[PDB]
Amino acid sequence: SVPIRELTRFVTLIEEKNAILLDIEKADSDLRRKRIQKKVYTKTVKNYQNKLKELNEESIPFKRILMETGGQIQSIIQKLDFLEAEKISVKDSVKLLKDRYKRGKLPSKAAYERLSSDMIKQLASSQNKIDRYINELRAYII
């Protein structure tokens, strides 16, 4: 069926996780714009990464109960896992593309601009689907 108790807890947990992940991006942005000392960066990120590890541990029992129902809830959670990983990959891809471009190792400015635009769209597309699937879980409760 649908375990309302576990789902109600899980929805709050994954919103908090999505929020911390976006705070990590904010730290990443502050770093490359040199608006934060790398002292405060590696400190704050290691602190955020501990909140994540602890939230991910706490979510384990609820997530297992939810995935063992199969069907649509299981499917949504699996996509959320995928989309989170995909957004991380795109993040590292843009950073690499930027280093490869400033070192003059790309064919052309037009190629760089098209690929980087592609990656920014993919970042928004991934985050869009994450928010949508979080809202689909929430709709079970609210």
Author numbering: 466 to 607
Please give me the paper's original passages concerning this structure.
To probe the global structural similarities between the MK-D1 and eukaryotic Sec61/OST/TRAP translocons, we constructed the AF2 predicted models of MK-D1 Sec61, OST and TRAP complexes and superimposed them onto the eukaryotic Sec61/OST/TRAP translocon cryo-electron microscopy (cryoEM) structure. We were particularly intrigued by the cytoplasmic C-terminal domain of OST1, which forms a cytoplasmic helical bundle in the MK-D1 model and in the eukaryotic structure (circled). To confirm the validity of the AF2 model in this region, we expressed, purified, crystallized, and solved the X-ray structure of this domain. Finally, to ascertain whether this cytoplasmic domain of MK-D1 OST1 can interact with ribosomes, we produced histidine-tagged domains from MK-D1 and human OST1 and carried out pulldowns on nickel-nitrilotriacetic acid (NTA) beads against HeLa cell lysate, and semi-purified and highly purified human ribosomes. Ribosomes were detected to bind to the human and MK-D1 cytoplasmic C-terminal domains of OST1, but not to the negative control, the MK-D1 OST1 extracellular N-terminal domains. The C-terminal domains of OST1 were able to recruit ribosomes from samples with different levels of ribosome purity, indicating a direct and specific interaction. This finding suggests that MK-D1 OST1 participates in the recruitment of MK-D1 ribosomes to the Sec61/OST/TRAP translocon at the cell membrane for translation and translocation of membrane proteins and preproteins. A comparison of the surface residues of the human and MK-D1 cytoplasmic C-terminal domains of OST1 reveals surface patches of basic residues that cluster in regions that may be able to interact with the RNA components of the ribosome. Here, we show that the cytoplasmic C-terminal domain of archaea OST1 also mediates interactions with the ribosome, and specifically, the MK-D1 OST1 complex can engage human ribosomes, despite the ∼1.8 BY of divergence of the two species. Furthermore, we show that the cytoplasmic domain of Candidatus Prometheoarchaeum syntrophicum strain MK-D1 oligosaccharyltransferase 1 (ribophorin I) can interact with eukaryotic ribosomes.
In eukaryotes, the core Sec61 channel forms a larger translocon associating with the multimeric translocon-associated protein (TRAP) complex and oligosaccharyltransferase (OST) complexes. In the Sec61/OST/TRAP translocon, the TRAP complex aids ribosome docking to the Sec61 translocon and participates in protein folding, while the OST complex mediates N-linked glycosylation. Phylogenetic analyses indicate the inheritance of eukaryotic Sec61/oligosaccharyltransferase/translocon-associated protein translocon subunits from an Asgard archaea ancestor. Asgard archaea are predicted to have a complete Sec61αβγ complex and many of the components of the OST and TRAP complexes.
